[PDB]
Design a protein around this motif. Structure first.
Motif, PDB file in Angstrom:
ATOM      1  N   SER A  52       0.830  -1.196   0.000  1.00 59.71           N
ATOM      2  CA  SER A  52       0.000   0.000   0.000  1.00 59.71           C
ATOM      3  C   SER A  52       0.873   1.258   0.000  1.00 59.71           C
ATOM      4  O   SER A  52       0.522   2.257  -0.635  1.00 59.71           O
ATOM      5  N   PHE A  53       2.014   1.187   0.691  1.00 58.78           N
ATOM      6  CA  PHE A  53       2.915   2.329   0.831  1.00 58.78           C
ATOM      7  C   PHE A  53       3.412   2.866  -0.514  1.00 58.78           C
ATOM      8  O   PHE A  53       3.438   4.078  -0.724  1.00 58.78           O
ATOM      9  N   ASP A  54       3.801   1.973  -1.421  1.00 61.62           N
ATOM     10  CA  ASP A  54       4.337   2.393  -2.715  1.00 61.62           C
ATOM     11  C   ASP A  54       3.231   2.951  -3.608  1.00 61.62           C
ATOM     12  O   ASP A  54       3.431   3.931  -4.340  1.00 61.62           O
ATOM     13  N   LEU A  55       2.063   2.319  -3.531  1.00 63.24           N
ATOM     14  CA  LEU A  55       0.865   2.788  -4.225  1.00 63.24           C
ATOM     15  C   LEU A  55       0.598   4.230  -3.893  1.00 63.24           C
ATOM     16  O   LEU A  55       0.514   5.065  -4.782  1.00 63.24           O
ATOM     17  N   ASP A  56       0.447   4.505  -2.600  1.00 60.86           N
ATOM     18  CA  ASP A  56       0.131   5.839  -2.110  1.00 60.86           C
ATOM     19  C   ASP A  56       1.187   6.845  -2.547  1.00 60.86           C
ATOM     20  O   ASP A  56       0.861   7.939  -3.031  1.00 60.86           O
ATOM     21  N   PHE A  57       2.448   6.454  -2.376  1.00 62.80           N
ATOM     22  CA  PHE A  57       3.559   7.334  -2.671  1.00 62.80           C
ATOM     23  C   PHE A  57       3.607   7.626  -4.162  1.00 62.80           C
ATOM     24  O   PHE A  57       3.646   8.788  -4.567  1.00 62.80           O
ATOM     25  N   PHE A  58       3.603   6.573  -4.979  1.00 62.65           N
ATOM     26  CA  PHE A  58       3.643   6.775  -6.421  1.00 62.65           C
ATOM     27  C   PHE A  58       2.380   7.460  -6.933  1.00 62.65           C
ATOM     28  O   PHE A  58       2.446   8.352  -7.786  1.00 62.65           O
ATOM     29  N   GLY A  59       1.238   7.075  -6.365  1.00 62.22           N
ATOM     30  CA  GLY A  59      -0.026   7.711  -6.683  1.00 62.22           C
ATOM     31  C   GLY A  59      -0.023   9.196  -6.386  1.00 62.22           C
ATOM     32  O   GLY A  59      -0.370  10.014  -7.228  1.00 62.22           O
ATOM     33  N   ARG A  60       0.364   9.527  -5.167  1.00 60.50           N
ATOM     34  CA  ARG A  60       0.559  10.904  -4.755  1.00 60.50           C
ATOM     35  C   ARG A  60       1.389  11.665  -5.769  1.00 60.50           C
ATOM     36  O   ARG A  60       1.021  12.745  -6.208  1.00 60.50           O
ATOM     37  N   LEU A  61       2.500  11.070  -6.168  1.00 66.10           N
ATOM     38  CA  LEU A  61       3.483  11.750  -7.008  1.00 66.10           C
ATOM     39  C   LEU A  61       2.969  12.092  -8.410  1.00 66.10           C
ATOM     40  O   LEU A  61       3.185  13.202  -8.894  1.00 66.10           O
ATOM     41  N   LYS A  62       2.293  11.151  -9.068  1.00 69.91           N
ATOM     42  CA  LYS A  62       1.842  11.418 -10.433  1.00 69.91           C
ATOM     43  C   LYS A  62       0.659  12.399 -10.485  1.00 69.91           C
ATOM     44  O   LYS A  62       0.618  13.275 -11.349  1.00 69.91           O
ATOM     45  N   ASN A  63      -0.269  12.290  -9.533  1.00 73.59           N
ATOM     46  CA  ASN A  63      -1.316  13.304  -9.345  1.00 73.59           C
ATOM     47  C   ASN A  63      -0.787  14.718  -9.079  1.00 73.59           C
ATOM     48  O   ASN A  63      -1.563  15.640  -8.829  1.00 73.59           O
ATOM     49  N   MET A  64       0.530  14.880  -9.104  1.00 72.27           N
ATOM     50  CA  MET A  64       1.165  16.158  -8.826  1.00 72.27           C
ATOM     51  C   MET A  64       1.749  16.706 -10.111  1.00 72.27           C
ATOM     52  O   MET A  64       2.133  15.950 -11.006  1.00 72.27           O
ATOM     53  N   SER A  65       1.821  18.027 -10.194  1.00 72.71           N
ATOM     54  CA  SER A  65       2.522  18.688 -11.275  1.00 72.71           C
ATOM     55  C   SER A  65       4.000  18.535 -11.004  1.00 72.71           C
ATOM     56  O   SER A  65       4.399  18.208  -9.876  1.00 72.71           O
ATOM     57  N   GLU A  66       4.809  18.814 -12.023  1.00 72.39           N
ATOM     58  CA  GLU A  66       6.258  18.738 -11.894  1.00 72.39           C
ATOM     59  C   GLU A  66       6.841  19.754 -10.901  1.00 72.39           C
ATOM     60  O   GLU A  66       7.782  19.444 -10.177  1.00 72.39           O
ATOM     61  N   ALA A  67       6.288  20.956 -10.847  1.00 74.19           N
ATOM     62  CA  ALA A  67       6.755  21.929  -9.862  1.00 74.19           C
ATOM     63  C   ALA A  67       6.425  21.456  -8.457  1.00 74.19           C
ATOM     64  O   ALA A  67       7.156  21.721  -7.504  1.00 74.19           O
ATOM     65  N   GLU A  68       5.307  20.760  -8.328  1.00 75.04           N
ATOM     66  CA  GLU A  68       4.867  20.318  -7.024  1.00 75.04           C
ATOM     67  C   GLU A  68       5.684  19.130  -6.583  1.00 75.04           C
ATOM     68  O   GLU A  68       6.106  19.062  -5.438  1.00 75.04           O
ATOM     69  N   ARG A  69       5.919  18.209  -7.511  1.00 74.20           N
ATOM     70  CA  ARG A  69       6.747  17.042  -7.243  1.00 74.20           C
ATOM     71  C   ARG A  69       8.115  17.467  -6.760  1.00 74.20           C
ATOM     72  O   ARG A  69       8.734  16.774  -5.966  1.00 74.20           O
ATOM     73  N   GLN A  70       8.589  18.607  -7.244  1.00 72.65           N
ATOM     74  CA  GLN A  70       9.895  19.090  -6.836  1.00 72.65           C
ATOM     75  C   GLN A  70       9.884  19.845  -5.496  1.00 72.65           C
ATOM     76  O   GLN A  70      10.865  19.792  -4.750  1.00 72.65           O
ATOM     77  N   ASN A  71       8.782  20.531  -5.182  1.00 75.16           N
ATOM     78  CA  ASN A  71       8.662  21.235  -3.905  1.00 75.16           C
ATOM     79  C   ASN A  71       8.563  20.217  -2.803  1.00 75.16           C
ATOM     80  O   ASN A  71       9.328  20.235  -1.844  1.00 75.16           O
ATOM     81  N   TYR A  72       7.584  19.333  -2.948  1.00 73.99           N
ATOM     82  CA  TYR A  72       7.510  18.130  -2.149  1.00 73.99           C
ATOM     83  C   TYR A  72       8.763  17.442  -2.562  1.00 73.99           C
ATOM     84  O   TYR A  72       9.297  17.765  -3.616  1.00 73.99           O
TER      85      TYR A  72
END
Length: 380
Positions: A52-72
């Motif tokens: 579940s951990f990788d799902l959430d993490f990877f899921g979180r990440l793609k639902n993000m814009s590139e600027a957001e992925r980098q801030n996070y």
């Protein structure tokens, strides 16, 4: 220095070597994310070619814009998230590898056993002893065994692939580490493990970040909402404190917070008061939801662990009786007391029990990783 978490959690020396190697080879956080993704990817390759951990993490990440992925991912919880993600995938890939080495070993032993049993039959069949359809099906089990062997050989390659990816170009892939069947129960956990350890979970760090962002007194939020208990008993089991947090036969969460000191100020009143409040409410409700889930995850893993330990214990017991029965059958055989076929049949029961035991040991390993993850990176 967060190496203390995996170094003191994982007991297996080989796996700690591999984890240490992969951390060195993955200095850049974004790249480590690519490698894990791809290591995960070429297992799903068995479906699209024909945690579940990788799902959430990877899921979180793609639902993000590139600027957001980098801030996070510049925040502390994201580095903690990527550390854990890396550690747990290296460990999982290794167990997958060792599992495959082991099933493959048994599968080849089974083959030889089926070939001996077969060869025996056809010498007797030419003296009138068996059915041609028996002889027929004996050929089938050999061919299906040959099948699994190639199948296990593919699983081995899949996991070696995942390992090299996480490890980098210069990583030595482990040989098959031979299994002592009498040491498979999991290792003891520290007694009286403090629930404070759970504050190091990325999801709870992120939740406390949201609290600080709505201007919460973090101390006051923790005192209000975070059960300060012990997670483990004198043995490596769920503590009663932990258990009591869930209603009996409902699993419903029991904790009723009481706020002794106000968590948010009246603040900078004037304008947008209601909206600031909403954010305060949200960060709090989110804090709560993460906490109860953290505690539930730990409880569920501790329970799964006790269950797999009991199952493994039972399989070890069957195995010991099957080993003693085989030896006795071998001696009898040598005395003309039993047929050779009875000896092979007994050996096959050993093989199948060994395979079950391997499955359970592996499920135990997957669960340890779960625990390591639910703890937010070990128990230091």
């Amino acid at each position: 220095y967060q190496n203390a978490g995996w170094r003191t959690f994982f007991v297996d020396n080989q796996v700690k070597t591999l984890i240490s190697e992969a951390l060195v080879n993955n200095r850049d956080l974004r790249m480590a994310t690519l490698k894990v993704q791809e290591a995960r990817a070429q297992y799903r390759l068995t479906d699209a070619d024909r945690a579940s951990f990788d799902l959430d993490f990877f899921g979180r990440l793609k639902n993000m814009s590139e600027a957001e992925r980098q801030n996070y991912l510049a925040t502390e919880e994201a580095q903690r998230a990527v550390h854990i993600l890396l550690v747990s995938n290296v460990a999982q890939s290794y167990f997958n590898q060792q599992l495959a080495y082991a099933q493959l070993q048994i599968a080849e032993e089974t083959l030889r056993n089926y070939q001996q049993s077969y060869a025996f039959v056809e010498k007797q069949l030419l003296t009138g002893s068996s059915n041609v359809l028996a002889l027929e099906q004996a050929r089938g089990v050999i061919e299906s065994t040959r099948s699994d062997i190639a199948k296990r050989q593919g699983e081995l390659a899949q996991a070696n692939n995942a390992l090299q990816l996480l490890l980098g170009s210069y990583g030595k892939l482990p040989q098959a580490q031979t299994v002592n069947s009498d040491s498979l129960q999991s290792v003891k956990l520290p007694a009286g493990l403090s629930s404070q350890i759970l504050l190091q979970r990325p999801d709870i760090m992120e939740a406390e970040h949201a609290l600080m962002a709505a201007n919460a007194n973090i101390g006051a939020a923790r005192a209000a909402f975070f059960p300060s208990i012990s997670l483990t008993s004198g043995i490596s089991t769920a503590s009663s404190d932990l258990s009591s947090l869930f209603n009996a036969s409902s699993g419903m969460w029991n904790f009723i917070p009481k706020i002794e000191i106000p968590i948010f100020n009246a603040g900078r009143n004037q304008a947008n008061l209601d909206i600031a409040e909403i954010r305060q409410q949200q960060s709090v409700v989110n804090y709560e939801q993460k906490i109860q889930n953290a505690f539930k995850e730990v409880a569920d893993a501790l329970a799964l662990r006790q269950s797999l330990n009991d199952q493994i214990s039972a399989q070890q017991r069957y195995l010991a009786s099957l080993q003693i029965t085989l030896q006795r059958a071998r001696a009898l055989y040598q005395h003309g007391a039993v047929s050779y076929l009875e000896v092979l049949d007994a050996e096959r029961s050993l093989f199948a029990t060994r395979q079950t035991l391997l499955d359970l040991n592996y499920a135990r390993q997957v669960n340890e990783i779960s625990l390591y993850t639910a703890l937010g990176g070990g128990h230091h």
